[PDB]
């Protein structure tokens, strides 16, 4: 399912000036835009080739939207201090996540529009794109203001229209990378743990859609237990890494197999040491 | 009274400022102040400075509060400076509340015993919405406020008795939430009261 997701973070820093505001946008697992209030002469910046040619009007109004949202967050943080009866001495964090899921038939599958304050759910637009869920009585004030402002109707038109239409455009202009899965390069390494045992580590490197499954099998049977697995991690170039390891009695190495499942492989891969 | 007496402060075209529009806050005095300071107190305190302008009769400074945003709403006082470097300020002007409007849906505004009334008859104006505004504001063509009447048939409403009808006027109504008293809804549909 393709998706476009935006993430906004504002952190107040009492005494150290105005809040730090940071926003990033993704199509699937590809960052494509960034805005940081601490950069010199901050503006929206491209981070993927397929928005670099959107033109100066596109980039100017995104930049102005970011700058207005940074100041809107400053009022929001001040309101939140009031709602929770907090002093002006503490640092506080407002996070906003907003985005789109398409699915195979490529119109809106699911919208997202939701907030956290100091790491806790605050308010969320419901799956119906017309009503809100407030997490506590402070967020009930925000809910009451947003019902009076008819905010849900603006979020909804963004999620069903703008968000879907521009995601489709980004998928087309960037189809050469967003829609061409980059397959993992795989190998198994072998690290003796003793004389009676060794660690088999199955490696997947440089794969782009971050979703992947590595399963060690013994005579075809899934080795659920006894398999250490790391969190998928960014390689730093847009691709991802992951390994899965298993402790085997030395001598029986070759009845172990690694099963790799990934969108960039026509068939899943079976490999051995 | 001395040169430290307070100047005056007004909003052009008025103190109720629609979102993203501009207002001019003018300070003026017959005192030939060389500078003026405009101070907004409260949650977003700020201070602006303008050299004084001297025309016949009045010494003024015209502060433009532009792209109306919520951080610009609040109470404004202003000061004249008898001096140039370190400021030697006059008494503060009377405070002036500058509100941003247009942030929420308009309330309804109606005349209880009819809007066209005979002279002498008492008349009640009522501000009602189904948004849960805390406070309602009634303005004849600017600031009169009453608290909301909590969930009755689900509407929140506040009633303004106008007393026995002398002159009449055109009335508008705005709703507001307790924690941000300078941030108002859209104007209700204006109601013309005729006292015949």
């Amino acid at each position: 399912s393709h998706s476009m997701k935006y993430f906004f973070t504002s952190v107040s820093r009492p005494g150290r000036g105005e809040p730090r505001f940071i926003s990033v946008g993704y199509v699937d697992d590809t960052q494509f835009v960034r805005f940081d209030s601490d950069a010199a002469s901050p503006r929206g910046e491209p981070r993927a080739p397929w928005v670099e040619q959107e033109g100066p009007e596109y980039w100017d109004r995104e930049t102005q939207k970011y700058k207005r949202q940074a100041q809107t967050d400053r009022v929001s943080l001040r309101n939140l201090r009031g709602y929770y009866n907090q002093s002006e001495a503490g640092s506080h964090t407002l996070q906003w996540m907003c985005g789109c899921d398409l699915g195979p038939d490529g119109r809106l599958l699911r919208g997202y529009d939701q907030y956290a304050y100091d790491g806790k759910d605050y308010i969320a637009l419901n799956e119906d794109l017309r009503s809100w869920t407030a997490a506590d009585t402070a967020a009930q004030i925000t809910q009451r203001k947003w019902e009076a402002a008819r905010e849900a109707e603006q979020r909804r038109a963004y999620l069903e229209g703008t968000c879907v239409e521009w995601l489709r455009r980004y998928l087309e202009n960037g189809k050469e990378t967003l829609q061409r899965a980059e397959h993992p390069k795989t190998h198994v390494t072998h690290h003796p743990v003793s004389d009676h045992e060794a660690t088999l580590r199955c490696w997947a490197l440089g794969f782009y859609p971050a979703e992947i499954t590595l399963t060690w099998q013994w005579d075809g049977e899934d080795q659920t237990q006894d398999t250490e697995l790391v969190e998928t991690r960014p390689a730093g170039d847009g691709t991802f890494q992951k390994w899965a390891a298993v402790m085997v009695p030395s001598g029986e190495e070759q009845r172990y197999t690694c099963h790799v499942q990934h969108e960039g492989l026509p068939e899943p891969l079976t490999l051995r040491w | 009274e001395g040169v430290h007496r307070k100047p005056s402060l007004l909003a052009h075209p008025g103190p109720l400022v629609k979102s993203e529009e501009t207002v001019i806050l003018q300070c003026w005095s017959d005192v030939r102040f060389e500078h003026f300071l405009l101070h907004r107190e409260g949650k977003y305190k700020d201070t602006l400075h303008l050299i004084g302008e001297h025309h016949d009769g009045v010494s003024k400074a015209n502060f433009s509060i532009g792209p109306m945003m919520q951080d610009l709403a609040g109470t404004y006082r202003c000061y004249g400076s008898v001096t140039h470097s370190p400021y030697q300020l006059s008494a503060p002007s009377d405070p002036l509340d500058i509100v941003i409007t247009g942030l929420y849906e308009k309330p309804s505004l109606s005349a209880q015993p009819g809007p066209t009334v005979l002279a002498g008859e008492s008349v009640t104006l009522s501000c009602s919405s189904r948004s849960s505004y805390d406070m309602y504001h009634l303005s004849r063509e600017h600031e009169r406020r009453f608290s909301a009447g909590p969930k009755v048939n689900g509407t929140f409403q506040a009633d303004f008795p106008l007393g026995p009808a002398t002159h009449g006027g055109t009335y508008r109504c705005f709703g507001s939430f307790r924690d941000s008293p300078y941030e108002w809804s859209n104007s209700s549909d204006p109601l013309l009261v005729s006292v015949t």
Binding site: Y6, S23, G25, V33, G44, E62, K65, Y66, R68, Q69, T72, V75, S76, N79, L80, L94, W96, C98, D113, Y115, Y122, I123, A139, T142, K145, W146, A149, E151, Q154, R155, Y158, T162, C163, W166 | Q70, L103
Partner: peptide, 9 residues
């Protein structure tokens, strides 16, 4: 495209 500018909380 950014989700525009939302109302304050």
């Amino acid at each position: 495209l950014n989700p525009s500018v939302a109302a304050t909380l």
